[PDB]
Design a protein around this ligand. Sequence first.
Ligand SMILES: CCCCCCCCCCCCCCCCC[C@@H](O)O[C@H](CO[C@H](O)CCCCCCCCCCCCCCC)COP(=O)(O)OCC[N+](C)(C)C
Ligand SMILES: CCCCCCCC/C=C\CCCCCCCC(=O)O[C@H](COC(=O)CCCCCCC/C=C/CCCCCCCC)COP(=O)(O)OCCN
Ligand SMILES: CCCCCCCCCCCC(=O)SCCNC(=O)CCNC(=O)[C@H](O)C(C)(C)COP(=O)(O)O
Lengths: 104, 459, 178, 70, 63, 219, 55, 128, 88, 84, 175, 124
Amino acid sequence: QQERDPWYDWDHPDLRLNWGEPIHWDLDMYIRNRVDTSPTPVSWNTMCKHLFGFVAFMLFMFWVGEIYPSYQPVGPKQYPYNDLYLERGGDPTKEPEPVVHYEI
Amino acid sequence: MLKIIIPTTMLLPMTWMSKHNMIWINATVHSLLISLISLSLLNQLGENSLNFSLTFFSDSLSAPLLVLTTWLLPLMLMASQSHLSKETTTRKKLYITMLILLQLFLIMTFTATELILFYILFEATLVPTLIIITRWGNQTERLNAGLYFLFYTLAGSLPLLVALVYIQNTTGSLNFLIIHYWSHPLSNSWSNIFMWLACIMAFMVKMPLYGLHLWLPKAHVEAPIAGSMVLAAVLLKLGGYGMMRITTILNPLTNYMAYPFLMLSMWGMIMTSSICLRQTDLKSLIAYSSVSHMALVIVAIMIQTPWSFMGATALMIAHGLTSSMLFCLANTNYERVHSRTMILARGLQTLLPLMATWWLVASLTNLALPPSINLIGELFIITASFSWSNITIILMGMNMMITALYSLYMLITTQRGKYTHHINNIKPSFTRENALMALHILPLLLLTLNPKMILGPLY
Amino acid sequence: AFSAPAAYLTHQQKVLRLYKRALRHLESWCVHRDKYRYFACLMRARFDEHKNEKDMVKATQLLRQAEEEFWYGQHPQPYIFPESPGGTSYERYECYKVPEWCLDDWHPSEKAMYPDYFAKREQWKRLRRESWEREVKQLQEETPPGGPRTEALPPARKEGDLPPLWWHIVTRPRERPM
Amino acid sequence: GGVHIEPRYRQFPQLTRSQLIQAEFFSATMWFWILWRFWHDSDAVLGHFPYPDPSQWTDEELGILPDDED
Amino acid sequence: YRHSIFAVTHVLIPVWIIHYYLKYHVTAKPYTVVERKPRIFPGDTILETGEVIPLMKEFPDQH
Amino acid sequence: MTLCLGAITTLFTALCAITQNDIKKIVAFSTSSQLGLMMVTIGINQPHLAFLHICMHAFFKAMLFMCSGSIIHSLNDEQDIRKMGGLYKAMPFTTTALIIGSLALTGMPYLTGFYSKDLIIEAVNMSYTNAWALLMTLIATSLTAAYSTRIIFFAFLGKPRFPPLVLINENNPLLINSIKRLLIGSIFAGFIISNNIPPMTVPNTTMPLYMKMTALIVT
Amino acid sequence: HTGQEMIISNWHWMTLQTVELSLSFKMDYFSVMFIPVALFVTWSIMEFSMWYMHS
Amino acid sequence: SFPKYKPSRLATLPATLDPAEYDISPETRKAQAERLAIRSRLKREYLLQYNDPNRLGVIEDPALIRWTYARSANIYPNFRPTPKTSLLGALFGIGPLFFWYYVFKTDRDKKEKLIQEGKLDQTFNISY
Amino acid sequence: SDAPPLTLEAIKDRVLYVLKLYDKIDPEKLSVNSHFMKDLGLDSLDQVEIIMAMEDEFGFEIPDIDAEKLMCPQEIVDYIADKKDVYE
Amino acid sequence: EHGHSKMELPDYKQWKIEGTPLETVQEKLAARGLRDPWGRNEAWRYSGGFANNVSFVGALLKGFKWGFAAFVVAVGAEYYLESQ
Amino acid sequence: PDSWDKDVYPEPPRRTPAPAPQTSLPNPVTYLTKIFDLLVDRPVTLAREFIEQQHAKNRYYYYHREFRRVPDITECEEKDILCMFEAEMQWRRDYKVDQEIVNIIQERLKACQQREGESYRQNCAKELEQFTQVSKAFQDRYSDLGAHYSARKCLAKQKQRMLAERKAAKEAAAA
Amino acid sequence: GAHLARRYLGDASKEPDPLRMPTFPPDYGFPERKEREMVATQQEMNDAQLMLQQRDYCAHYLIQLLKCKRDSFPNFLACKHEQHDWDYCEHLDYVKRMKEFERERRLLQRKKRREQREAEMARG
Ligand SMILES: CCCCCCCCCCCCCCCCC[C@@H](O)O[C@H](CO[C@H](O)CCCCCCCCCCCCCCC)COP(=O)(O)OCC[N+](C)(C)C
Ligand SMILES: CCCCCCCC/C=C\CCCCCCCC(=O)O[C@H](COC(=O)CCCCCCC/C=C/CCCCCCCC)COP(=O)(O)OCCN
Ligand SMILES: CCCCCCCCCCCC(=O)SCCNC(=O)CCNC(=O)[C@H](O)C(C)(C)COP(=O)(O)O
C-alpha cells in the first residue's frame, strides 16, 4: 500500500484504500507501517550481493587483523612488588615465587 | 472468613428488593464496602497461614487473589451499566445475581481448606459464567462459544475428581495441611504417571495451555464486557492457584513430567505472541496476549523454585488487572463503533485524548515497563528459568520483543494516524468510563510500591 | 488530487510526465543553478529532437528506451518538497485536523464562548440541509443510467442550487489548523 | 523577543550590527584561544620528550658480547 | 522578586526535607551512606589522632 | 568484540554520512560514528577517556544540532542541503557557531574535541590491537573531516538556492543565548575539565613524530 | 577538591530471601560529572525549544 | 544500452518498466474503462451515503466485513486435508517442540552430569 | 514559522513576476487571463516548465494530473489560493 | 504584531544576466545553438549581497585577524610584565 | 549513634587528612559549606530539637519477642502431627534468621567494597572470606529444597550429605 | 611500525614475540644486573589508592602530583613541575622497555648467527 497513488483522493487517505473495493488478504502486513514492496533504484539481488560481500569482507579482515596484531617495540610493563601480588588477589600466606625486574 | 462470605450473600436480597432505578447504586456501594472489608485478609504471617476454621483458611497466595476478586465486582457493575440499559428490571437483577454468585463461588474457592470442596466450587463457577456468555451475548456464535468453554473444562476436570477421591482412599485426607505435612515421594510408574496427568491437566486446560487454548478466544470474544473481565482477570488464575496447591504431592515426578508442557509453553508463548501481530480484532488480540502471559506463568509453576512461585503470583495479579483494563478500553470503543475491528476506527487520540492516555498506560503495563509489577513477575520468572537452563533466555527474550511490538501496534493502529472520516458519532468519554480506567490503573501503580503483598508465601 | 483521474494516460501525458521527472532528477543531480540550467536546456534539446515524429510504434519504442535510461540514472535520493508525499513534513499537521462535527458535542458552557461563530454555524447547517435535498434529485436526474462512468461531478445549474456533494469539500479542516 | 525584520523577496536580508559584532567576537575569541594555547602549551601537539633511535644504542649497554663468549 | 520566591520554594524547601531525611533517618540505619575513604598522602595530619604520616625515601631529584 | 564492533560502526556510519543530503541525517550519522569511536575507546581498555569523550561530544554535537535546527526553521521547514546556498553572510551567528562546532568535532587543537579525540587516537595507535580496527579508526577520522567539509560547503559557501521569499532571521534572544552558552562550552570546557579531573591513566609520554601527529595529518 | 565519592542507599524496596533490593544512588566521579553536563545541555536545548516550538 | 533492473518479490517492477502497458489493444482500453466505471459507481455510492446530513453513524462497508470474515471464520469450512497441509502442519507444529525438547534435555543432562561429578563451581549460587 | 499571511494580490503579483522573467513570453502581451497555448503560442513543454517554475517559486509541487490542466495565470493563482486556504 | 506592512516586489527589469556564470551558460549553449528561457529568472541569486563569495579557508579563518591582534598584544604584555 | 550495634557492623576509625592550603587563594568549597551549614543545617537542627522534645514529652516502649525452643523434626514421631507442626514452625523461623545473617554479611561486603576505594581487591579479603564461608553454609543447608520445602526435606538432604561424608571418610581411612 | 613489516613478511623467528618476553636469562648479557628500586612503600601507596595499573615504579611522582592537586585546588594550574617530573619518569620507563625490546632483538640475532655458524662448521 506504500506504492499506491499518494495523490489520488482516497476515502481512507492514511490507509490509501477506497470504500467498497476488494481488500488484499495480507492488508495488515502492507499498511505503510510495515513491509513495503516499492521498486528500488537498485535490483534486489545486487543489494543482497553488495551487502553480503561488505559484511563478509569486514569479518574476514577483522579475523586477519586478529591474526596479525599491531604493537610498539617495547617489552612488557614492569610492576614492583612481585608483579603487584599482594593487592591483586591477595593471599599473603603463600610467599609467592619472587620475580625481580631487570634495570637496563 | 464468614465476615466476607455473609455480606456477599446479603448482596442478593439487597439487589432483589431494590428499586427499579437504584439497583446499580446499591450494588456498587455495597460491593466496594465488601472489598474494603476483604482488605483485612492481606495481613499475613511468615509462618503457615491464617487458619480461620476447619473449612476455610487463608494464605498469602490466596489473599491477593481474594482481594482482586472482591475488587473486580464494582468495576464489572460499572461497565455492565451501559449495555444493559434497555433490559427489564428482572433481567438486570438476574445479571447482578449471576455476578454475585460468581464472586461468592470464587471467594469460597480461594479459601477451600479441602480439595473436594475446592473442586466443587471450582466447577460451580462454570454455571454463572456459561449463562452470562450464552444469554447476554451479542453475536450468534456465543452459543457455540459457550459449548467450548464448557466441554473443554469438563474434559479436563472429570479425571481430576477421580484422582482426588482415589487419593483420599490411599492417604485418608485431602485437607491441604495434612497433605502438606504427610507428603511422600511419587515413584516413577505408569499408575503414578497417569495420576499426575489427571491431577495436572484439569488446571492445565484453564490457564490455558497452548494447544488447549482454543476455547479462550471464543469465550472472550463472544462474552459481554463483565464476562470478559471476570474470565481474563480471575477465572484464568484458578488453574495457577490449583497447580500451586496440588504440585506439593506430585514430586519427584514433576521434574520428569515437566518437559512435555514446558516446551508447549516455552514455544507457545512465541506462537500466540506472533498471532497477536496479525489480528484484525481487538478482543482476540487481548485474548492471545492473555494466553502468552499465562503460558509464562505455567512455565514458572513447572520450574518449581521460590523465585518461580513469587514471579508467577505477581504476574497473575498484574495480568488480571491489565487484561481487565484492556478489555474495558476495547469495549468503550465497541460501544461507539459497534464493529470490534481494529482497523475500522482510527485516529482516536485526536478525538478522545484522555482515553488515549488510558490506552497508553494500559499498553505500557502490558508491555512490562519497569518498575511495574508486570515486569517484577516477568523478571522473576526469567531469572528462575535461566537458573533452570541457560538457553531458555533466548525464547524468553524473543517473547519480550514480540510483546512490545504488538502492544504498541495496538496503540498505534487505534489511537494514532488519521481519524476515519465517515464516523461522526464518537461522543466524548463519560465520567463512568474514565473512572473505570482510573480504578483499574491506580491499584497497579500503588501495588508497585509494596511488592511483598503480591509475591506470595515464598517471599 | 482535485481532478478525477481518467481511464488511462495518453502518450502525451506519459511524455510530459517523464519530461518533468527527468528535469526534477537532473535538478537533484546538478545542485547549482547555472549547471542545472545548462543541462536542463540540453535535456530539452535532446527531448524535442523527436517532437515532430509521426508514427506511434517507433514513438512508443522511444519513451520506453528513455524510461530505462531514467531508471538507471534516477538519483536514488531525489529532492522532495517538504509537504510532498515523501517529504520530511508530509503529514506533520494531520494530528491537528479535527472534524467539524466534533463541535456539535461541545458543552453549552463551551458554546457560550464563541456565540457568533455558532450562529454562523447554524446558518451553514440549515443551508446544507436544504441544498442536500436539492442535490440528491439533481444527481439522480443527471446521472447516466447504469451508474456513473467517471468520478466527475456536475456543477449547479439553477439559481439557488449548490454543487452536488459540496459539504465535505468546502468544510476541509485547514492546511495548518494549529 | 527581538526586533521586527521584514521579508525581502530576492534581495539580501536585513542584518543587525549586533549579531555581526557578536559573531565576529566569538570567532575572534576562538582563534585567540587557539593561538594562546599553542604559544603557552605547544608540547601537546609537537611533543615534549624525544623518541630515541634503537639502532643508535651501543652493544655495551644492551648486554651483547662479541658472539664468542657465551 | 520572582527568582527570590522561586529559590525559596523550589530549591530551599526540598533541600530542608532532603537534609532532614538523610541526617536523621537514612543515617540512623547502618551502611546506608558509605563514603569512599579520603586519600592519605605522606605528610598529612589526621584530625582524630593528630599523628603525622612520614615523608618518602628522598628519591634522587634530577630534571 | 567491543573494539571490532566500534570500528566497523564508526567506519560504516561515516561512509554513509559522506554522501547524505539531509542535514539532520548527516549529523545523526556523525553522532553514530562518534559513538562507535567511544566503543573503540572502551575496547582498548580506556574507560575514563571514553567518558571524557562523551562529555565533550555532548557540548559540540548538541550545538551542531541546534545550529541545524536554526537553519531549518529559518528556511521554512527545509532540510535538504541542495536548497541551502549562501548563508555565510545571510546568518552570521549560526555560521560561526557551526564552524566552531565542526572544528571541535574534527579535533582542531586546543578545542573541546581535541582533549578527548586526540588522546583516543594516541591510545589506539600504541596498543596491542587489531590492525584492521586501527585502520578503520583512521579512515573514520578522515571521513569525519570530510563530512564536516560537506556540511560547510553545501550549506554556507555557494550561491543561494532557497525559494525567493527570503525569511531568514536570527535576532531572537532565546536562540542567541542558547547557542552562545554551548559556544563558550565547546571552546573552554575541554581545557577546564581536562585540567581539573585527577589523573586516571598512565600518559603516553613518548611517541614517534609521525605517530604523535597522525590524527592531524588524517584530518 | 578532594575526590569525594558516595553511595546513598536510602529507601529499602524489598528483600527476597538473601537478596536485598533498595533505592540506592551512586554518586561517584561519573555521576557527579555527567549530571552537570546533561543539565547544562538540557537547559540550553529547552531555551532553544522555547523559540523553535512557539507555533 | 544500460544494465537492466531485475524485479523481485519485495522489490516489484515499476509501472514505467512494464511492457504490458505498451501492448495497447482495444480490449485493454475497454477493460480499463469498465474498471474505472465500477470504481466510479462505488465512489458515487460512498459519497452519496457520506455527504448525507441525516446519516449520523458509521458507513457499513461490505468489503471490510468480507475481509474479516474470510480471514477468521471462512478458514475451516474450506480446509481440506491434503499432503501439503498435512506435512506443513506436522512440521510447523511438531518439529519446533521436539527440537527445543532435544536442546533443553541435552543441556540439562550435561549440567546434571557436571553436578554429580562435582566440577561445576556453584559457589555463591544461593538464589534459584 | 513566523511566515506572513500571503494574500491573493501577493499570489497574482508573484505569478505575473515569474511569467515576466520568462523571456519566451513578451511582458506587454501577457495578462492574468491570457491563455498559454493560443494567446501566447507556447508548446506543452513550455507549460510544464512554467508549472515547474511555479513550484520552485512557491515551495510546493502540484500533482501532474492537476498541473496539465492549468492554462491561465488566473487559474494558477486560483489553484494556489485554494491549496493554501487564502481568504482575500 | 506580525510582519504586515505590504512589502513590494522589485521591478523585473532589474534582473539582467550580465555579470554572472549565466553568460557562460548562454555562450556554451549558443556554441551548439541553444538558449535558456529561464536564465534571467535566477539572476537574483547573483545580484545583491550574494554577489561576493567566501572561500572555505576564508570561512574557517573568520576571526583570525582580531584574534591574532589580541594574541600578540597579550604576548607583548606578558613579556613586559615577566621581565621586570 | 547508638541506633545500631557497632560490633555487628564494624567500621574502621575513619582517619581523615587535615587541610594544608598551599596558596592564599580562598577556595569556594569552604565558603559554600559554611553557607550551606548556616542556611540548611541550623533550621533542620532546630526542627529536630522541637520534634525530639515533643517525643520526650510522651515516652513509651515496645519489646522484642522471645521464642522458646521446641523439639525439632529429628525428635518427632513419624505420624505425630503436633510435634511435626511445632518443629516445622521452628525450622521456618530459623530459616528466616539464617537469611538475615546472610543479608548482614552481604551488607558488610558491600560497605567494604565501597569504602576501600581502589584498594578493595586487597582490603576486603576478610569480608570476602567471611561471605564465602556463610554462603557455603547457607547453600549446604537450604539449596535445592524446592518451592515446597520443609524441615523433612532439609533433614533428608543433611542425612544424604552425612552418608556421603561417612562413606568417603571410611574409604580414605582404609586406603 | 617497521618491525611489523619485518616480522610479518620476513623470518618470524628473526624478531621477538611480545607475548613471550623475555626469552633470555636476565644475566645472559652481563653479570652485574643492578636491580630497580621502588620509592613508595606499600602502606602509603595503598593509602593514596591510585589504581592497580598506576602502581608502577613511577608512583612517587604521581603521589606528589596528587598532593599538590589536593593542596592547591582552586588554582588548578599551580603545579606543573610535578606533572613534568611524572611525565619524565614515565618516559624513562618507556625507554627502558624499548631498550629491553631491542636487547632481546639483537640477542636473538647473535644467537641465530651462532647456531648457524656451528651448523656451518659441522657441515664443513
Ligand atoms: C499528577 C499530579 C501529582 C501531584 C502529587 C505529587 C506528590 C508526589 C508523590 C507521588 C508518588 C511518589 C512516591 C513516594 C513514596 C511515598 C509513599 C510510600 O512511602 O509509602 C509506601 C506504602 O504504601 C503502601 O505500601 C502501598 C499501597 C498499597 C495499595 C493497595 C490497594 C488498596 C485498595 C485497592 C484495591 C485492590 C486491587 C488489587 C488487588 C491486589 C511505602 O512505605 P514503606 O517504606 O514500605 O513503609 C510504610 C511505613 N512504615 C515504615 C510504618 C511501615
Ligand atoms: C481437554 C482434553 C483434556 C483431557 C485430559 C484427560 C487425560 C487425563 C490423564 C488420564 C485420565 C485418567 C487417569 C487416571 C485417574 C487417576 C487414577 C490413579 O491415579 O490411579 C491409577 C489409575 O491408572 C489408570 O487407570 C490409567 C488408565 C487410563 C485409561 C484412560 C486413558 C486415556 C488416554 C490417556 C493417554 C493420553 C495422555 C495425555 C492426555 C492429554 C490430554 C489431551 C493407578 O491405577 P491403580 O488401580 O490405583 O493401581 C494400583 C495398584 N497397582
Ligand atoms: C537524470 C536522469 C536521467 C534522465 C534520462 C531521460 C531520458 C531523456 C531521453 C528521452 C527521449 C525522448 O525524448 S522520447 C520521445 C517520445 N516520442 C515523441 O516525443 C513523439 C511525439 N511526442 C509528442 O507529440 C509530445 O506530445 C510532445 C510533442 C513532445 C509534447 O507534446 P505537447 O505539444 O502537447 O506539449
